[PDB]
Ligand binder design. Structure first.
Ligand code: CA
Lengths: 439, 440
């Protein structure tokens, strides 16, 4: 089963090169102004000290865990092209600054999850450059799958890669020495104090390796959290031998279908959510990392086409579900943008730039979850009341809660219709209601 | 009258609601979008009111308060020149009859403006005194100091508030009373359901007792509501009105939802006091409102904050007494105080704030559906400096509208004796959040 702390977790995902530039002396020569349009090649100077300095913002939102995208020495702004998995990227800070982040995080009750990019590294990585250089004489030739020498990125890479990208050579995970390096990466950062690992494109490697991964990570501690990136069904990762959960892109698509697209009505959503619930095995519901967006999607508000009230319906649903809810940095203040690089805009720190009522609306849903124990540990039941209105009921030992979410122009619901209370509740246009009762 | 318990009012300033008949339009009529002024005409008409009853009903209203509609020489029609005719730009008596019929067909009631302290300087009686002086048969229908009559400097006759074009009726003349009682009787014969009293404080209670007797004599269920900006207590002794325009409740609500000057304790106390001052049987007759043709528009009072504005509406619709919506506020029209608040009502729905409209409708629908929200006692309860419950209880049934002006909070239903009977133990309120719950 998944670790129990997860029931209480609320995650804040950070793309560190865009959250806060606290240290200009770390910035590269070609650093762009903080207000610039994000691109696949530009750098803003976001750093680890920037995260430390805004921990208060992250706490005040209701978050108690961070998911960090890659932070190790790389040549891109997203850092999926790691070149040394054993140091912090020199533009993010040093190992000391990283330690200071861990400590400041744990003084405030905040757990840390890093991004484990094990299918591939960057072409700048020492082992890969050694192969380029020394070819068949490199000791790390078999750390990759290079077709022949000389190595060429032109016209198509003559080595295996992540989805054809020339600067992301694929790690040969069939090599024991590569697995040992991958496991020493897992343990090393756990030795530095992290609380879990998020797995990047885990489906490009293989279950056998991910089994060794769980054994190495859980061997250090049973409460370290492993979460699979997965866009389709999560079930393969929830058999008890690989991950503790999945990024719940299934719930994302269902929720947004309802609140933003209008393609699915409340009945299809409830059915979608009850089935995903049936699909996910016992012990693993708690481990699902639910989200409405990420660094791999367009921003939630953009998906809702600037309709902040509808967007609040999404968050209501998000915070209502079993699984740890995750907010993507800047969505809480109403940032907009298309898919990558559009969703990787720099986070503004002028409170006059924030959509404050969006922030307070999300804070409210988070606060009700944190205060009501059934919202964290209770059972999840989804029920349609009409085409535009859904109730997410959560059933605790000694208490029960419901979040009722209406996307129409207003209605009333008889709670006697939802299997403790016989109240009538009214919902305004784009309205929600959040109710609890002693059992 | 009992029917006031279920009444919801929609106030129309008839010049500005809807212009259905261009043939009625005056010569220098302005475009419908234009800025209102003390002299301009837009051509709003009675047929335009008939044509838009749908919108009124969809709002949830079942009663109109109309401002004066008799023949006059201003855009506001407070300067009546003939009390026994519809103003020629509004329509004819026939059209008026048609509006009544249509209204009766939808269970809508009608309330007109009784402007009895004064008429207009163009009124036939006044012009006859101006012409024939001491030989006019109507010299004592007014208070003219002497001849020739002059406005020039300042009127050498009594007026409403110094205004030369609004000479004051001598209500001490039985002929003038007779005339006033014929006006009340005449429009009641034309199908009308009641009267709003314009500045009744400028006349006297002896006159308003006769007024009541004549009106109630036609039918006990005809409603009488007095304009009063201060305490309403003097109008509620059983001998004059059935209620007043509740400007006291307005000042309290807006001080809390818009100004920030009054907190929830002070608002709860204010409302509880007002309630206790209102005599038994008269709570329902109170005509509750957030604004009128004599105030700046609600949304403008809330500095354009729609969510703040919706807190006002929630409160308004939660109170005992008949709630009234000033035409166009439901769609988010803005405006300063008169003339600014007499904008023409746009009918192109792309200009409306429809979340505001549907917000108001929801409060109305809750109230229409809950018997306690109409006939139940009223207890106002401060929970926080920023959060108030208005509770309504029918014997053992209970409704509650909870209204939060802060950034978000939680309402523990237990430990609040008046909220305790709801099965829900906790209720969340978002920022500027509203919660409406009812028992059983
Ligand atoms: Ca007209």
């Amino acid at each position: 089963t998944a670790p129990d702390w997860l029931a209480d977790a609320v995650f804040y995902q950070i793309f560190p090169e865009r959250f806060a530039n606290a240290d200009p002396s770390l910035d590269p020569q070609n650093v762009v102004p903080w207000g610039s349009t994000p691109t696949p090649d530009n750098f803003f100077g976001g750093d680890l000290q920037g995260i430390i300095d805004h921990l208060d913002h992250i706490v005040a939102l209701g978050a108690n865990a961070l998911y960090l995208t890659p932070i190790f020495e790389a040549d891109t702004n997203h850092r999926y092209d790691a070149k040394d998995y054993f140091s912090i990227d020199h533009r993010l800070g040093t190992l000391e600054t990283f330690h200071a982040l861990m400590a400041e995080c744990r003084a405030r009750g905040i757990r840390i999850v890093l991004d484990a990019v094990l299918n591939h590294c960057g072409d700048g990585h020492w082992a890969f450059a050694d192969v380029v250089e020394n070819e068949a004489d490199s000791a790390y030739v078999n750390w990759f799958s290079v077709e022949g020498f000389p190595v060429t990125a032109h016209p198509t890479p003559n080595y295996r890669t992540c989805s054809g990208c020339y600067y992301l050579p694929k790690w040969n995970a069939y090599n024991p020495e590569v697995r040992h390096h991958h496991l020493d990466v897992a343990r090393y950062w756990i030795d530095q104090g992290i609380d879990g690992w998020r797995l990047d494109v885990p489906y490009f490697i293989n279950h056998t390796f991910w089994r060794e991964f769980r054994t190495a990570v859980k061997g250090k501690s049973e409460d370290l959290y492993i979460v699979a990136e997965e866009w389709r069904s999560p079930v393969e990762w929830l058999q008890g031998d690989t991950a503790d959960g999945t990024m719940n892109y299934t719930a994302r698509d269902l929720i947004l279908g309802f609140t933003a697209d209008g393609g699915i009505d409340a009945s299809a959503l409830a059915a979608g959510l009850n089935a995903l619930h049936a699909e996910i095995p016992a012990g693993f519901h708690r481990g699902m990392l639910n989200l409405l967006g990420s660094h791999d999607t367009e921003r939630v508000l953009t998906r809702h086409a600037g309709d902040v009230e509808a967007a609040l319906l999404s968050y209501a649903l998000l915070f209502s579900l079993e699984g740890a809810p995750m907010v993507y940095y800047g969505d809480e203040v109403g940032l907009t943008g298309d898919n990558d690089p559009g969703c990787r805009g720099a986070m503004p720190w002028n409170e006059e730039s924030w959509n404050t009522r969006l922030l307070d609306g999300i804070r409210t849903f988070a606060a009700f979850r944190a205060h009501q124990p059934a919202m964290r540990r209770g059972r999840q039941t989804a029920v349609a009341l009409d085409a535009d209105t859904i109730a997410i009921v959560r059933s605790g030992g000694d208490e029960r809660a419901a979040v009722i979410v209406h996307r129409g122009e207003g209605t009333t619901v008889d709670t006697a219709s939802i299997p403790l209370d016989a109240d009538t509740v009214v919902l305004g246009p784009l309205g929600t209601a959040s109710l609890a009762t002693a059992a």
